[PDB]
Amino acid sequence: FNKITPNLAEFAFSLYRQLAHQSNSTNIFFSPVSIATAFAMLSLGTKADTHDEILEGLNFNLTEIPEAQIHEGFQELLRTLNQPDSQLQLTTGNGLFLSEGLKLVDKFLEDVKKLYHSEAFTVNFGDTEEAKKQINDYVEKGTQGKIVDLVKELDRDTVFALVNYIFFKGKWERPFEVKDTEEEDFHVDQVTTVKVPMMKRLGMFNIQHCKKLSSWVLLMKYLGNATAIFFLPDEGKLQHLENELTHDIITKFLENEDRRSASLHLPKLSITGTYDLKSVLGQLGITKVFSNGADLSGVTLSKAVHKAVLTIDEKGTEAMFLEAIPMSIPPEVKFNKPFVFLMIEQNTKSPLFMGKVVNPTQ
Amino acid sequence: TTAI
Amino acid sequence: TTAI
């Protein structure tokens, strides 16, 4: 469906809203599914408030959905995410990292393997530099070399760590031509611009202006089972757009199939988001696991980090179809000022990644 | 798109 | 890329 997609969606927006206010001035990029998957998997060895906070903090109402059905949700999500169509690359994995002489509840062990398909590794936390090396190695491998250094610090007492990675690589169903990419202005401010390489294409797009959001809404399909949604707010309407996004509205857009002519300008870019999940998630009512009272007892971990990297370009491949373009003048739709976007997996409809581009050359 |  |  997925049973938990609505929740993941709402989590993505809560978490986004928190990142946006404040910094207010920084590119934003994160994977809502990576964060929620790691903490749903963690919650499984917690109890009492510590536990409840986590699931509530993930936008699951506990007086509403059976806790078991959540984890079956995540189990089915993960299964699905790891069966991409052959023209799409999509992988996710969870890793557990354990001290040699650490007392582990067998139940917790078998839950994460079954529900979260987790791998498990013994490491020597006695050698802090080397344990980090081994953790960051799992990620480097999962991420095909792109992330060499997720974890930069490890408290001396730690005997346990949990990692989720997701790797996505996609090709546009209807790509841009490299010949047409040219340097244009990007309006970081109402009065300030920077130069960015700007892709463009005249084509028939699933594009519309939505009054409820005061934004243009563009859906771009990848070959295989995924879509990107881009949102361009009307002048002075970014905040309104940020405040009015809901699962229901996005679901509607996904259902729309009409195409119309537009001259689309979209920046070629790379952005990265790096987050300290303590301050950020504590702002969403997940404080206990970070503190002493932490009921870490269903297992037998204070620091939490998230890093996400985006790259967008013309095709997605060094490696045909024809659109009927009407006479009428096409609207010029330029993603040349701050915008929001969402990446959605098709089968699950889950929010793989979400972000905001304030300045592509930041 | 690459997203990691 | 999430680590706890």
Domain residue limits, chain A: 1-172+268-315, 173-267+316-362
Q: Find all residues with CB under 8 Å of A188, minimum gap 6, and list them.
A: A194, A337, A338, A358, A359
Q: Are A70 and A60 in contact (CB under 8 A)?
A: yes
Residue A67 phi, psi (nearest 5): -50, -40
Strand blocks (E) in chain A: 28-30, 89-99, 119-123, 160-169, 182-187, 193-210, 215-222, 226-233, 260-267, 269-276, 305-312, 332-334, 339-345, 351-357
In what helix (H) or strand (E) does residue B2 lie, and over which residues does it extend?
A: strand B2-3
Residues of A in contact with B3 (CB under 8 A): 31, 166, 168-169, 308-311, 343, 352-353
CA-to-CA dists, residue A306 to A26, A82, A181, A272, A361, angstroms: 16, 21, 32, 10, 21
CA-to-CA dists, residue A347 to A85, A112, A218, angstroms: 10, 23, 19
Q: Inter-chain contact C4–A34, Cβ cutoff 8 Å?
A: no
In what helix (H) or strand (E) does residue B3 lie, and over which residues does it extend?
A: strand B2-3
How far off is chain B from A309, nearest CA to CA, in Å?
5
Q: Are A355 and A30 in contact (CB under 8 A)?
A: yes
Q: What residue has token string 């024809």?
A: A322
Round the CA-based radius of gyration of chain C to a whole number and report it. 4
Residue A31 phi, psi (nearest 5): -110, 105
Residues of B in contact with A316 (CB under 8 A): 1-2
Count how many residues are written for chain A. Answer: 362
| Chain A, nearest residue to B1 by Cα | A312
Rounded to whole angstroms, how far apart are CA atoms A358 and A240? Answer: 16
Round the CA-based radius of gyration of chain B to a whole number and report it. 4
Beta bridge partners of A215: A210, A233
The C-alpha angle A2, A351, A261, rounded to 5 degrees, equals: 110
Burial class (CB in 10 A: 0-12, 13-18, 19+), A211: exposed
Residues of A in contact with C4 (CB under 8 A): 38-39, 42, 161-163, 277, 301, 303-305
Q: What residue has token string 């480097």?
A: A140
Q: What does the buried/exposed string (b/e) look like for A158-168 if buried means 16 or more CB atoms within 10 Å of the residue's CB?
A: ebbbbbbbbbb
Residues of A in contact with C2 (CB under 8 A): 31, 34-35, 37-38, 163-165, 277, 304-306
Q: What does the buried/exposed string (b/e) look like for A288-316 if buried means 16 or more CB atoms within 10 Å of the residue's CB?
A: bbbeeebbbebbebebbbbbbbbbbbbeb
| Chain B, nearest residue to A342 by Cα | B3
Residue A41 phi, psi (nearest 5): -65, -40
Rounded to whole angstroms, how far apart are CA atoms A354 and A208? Answer: 20
Q: How large is the angle between the packed helices A32-43 and A106-116, nearest 10 degrees? A: 150
Q: Inter-chain contact B2–A168, Cβ cutoff 8 Å?
A: yes
Q: What residue has token string 């060094």?
A: A318
Q: Inter-chain contact C4–A166, Cβ cutoff 8 Å?
A: no
Q: Are A119 and A141 in contact (CB under 8 A)?
A: no
Residues of C in contact with A305 (CB under 8 A): 2-4
Residues of C in contact with A303 (CB under 8 A): 4
How far off is chain A from B3, nearest CA to CA, in Å?
5
- A164 CB within 8 Å of a chain C CB: yes
> How many residue pairs bridge chain A and chain C with CB atoms within 8 Å of each other?
48
Resolution (A): 1.9
How far off is chain B from A227, nearest CA to CA, in Å?
11
**For the residues of A119-137, what is the DSSP string, one character each?**
EEEEE-TTSHHHHHHHHHH
Rounded to whole angstroms, how far apart are CA atoms A65 and A3? Answer: 10
Q: Find all residues with CB under 8 Å of A21, minimum gap 6, and list them.
A: none
| Chain A, nearest residue to C4 by Cα | A304
Number of Cα atoms under 13 Å in the Cβ half of residue A247: 15
* Number of neighbours of residue A235 by Cβ within 10 angstroms: 8
The two structure tokens encoding residue A247: 């699962």
**CATH of span A1-172+268-315:** 3.30.497.10
Q: Inter-chain contact C1–A306, Cβ cutoff 8 Å?
A: yes
Q: Inter-chain contact C1–A308, Cβ cutoff 8 Å?
A: yes
Q: How large is the angle between the packed helices A32-43 and A5-20, nearest 10 degrees? A: 110
- What is the amino acid identity at position A265? H
Q: What residue has token string 């090709």?
A: A171
**DSSP reduced 3-state for A177:** coil
* Number of neighbours of residue A233 by Cβ within 10 angstroms: 19
Closest CA to A360 of A200, A137, A196: A196
In what helix (H) or strand (E) does residue A242 lie, and over which residues does it extend?
A: helix A238-244
Q: What residue has token string 């659109």?
A: A323
**For the residues of A77-105, what is the DSSP string, one character each?**
HHHHHTS--TTSEEEEEEEEEEETT----
CA A310 vs. chain centroid, Å, equals: 10
| Chain C, nearest residue to A132 by Cα | C3
Q: Inter-chain contact A228–B4, Cβ cutoff 8 Å?
A: no
Q: Find all residues with CB under 8 Å of A296, minimum gap 6, and list them.
A: A45, A46, A50, A289
Burial class (CB in 10 A: 0-12, 13-18, 19+), A195: exposed
**For the residues of A253-302, what is the DSSP string, one character each?**
HHH----EEEEEEEE-EEEEEEEEHHHHHHTTT--TTTSSS--GGGT---
Closest CA to A203 of A225, A219, A223: A219
The two structure tokens encoding residue A157: 């007492």
Rounded to whole angstroms, how far apart are CA atoms A281 and C4? Answer: 12
The two structure tokens encoding residue C3: 């680590």
CA-to-CA dists, residue A99 to A131, A160, A265, angstroms: 9, 6, 51
Q: Inter-chain contact C3–A31, Cβ cutoff 8 Å?
A: no
Q: Inter-chain contact A306–C4, Cβ cutoff 8 Å?
A: no
Q: Inter-chain contact A309–B1, Cβ cutoff 8 Å?
A: no
CA-to-CA dists, residue A209 to A47, A102, A228, A243, angstroms: 46, 56, 16, 17
Instruction: Tell which CATH architecture fits domain A173-267+316-362.
Output: Roll (2.30)
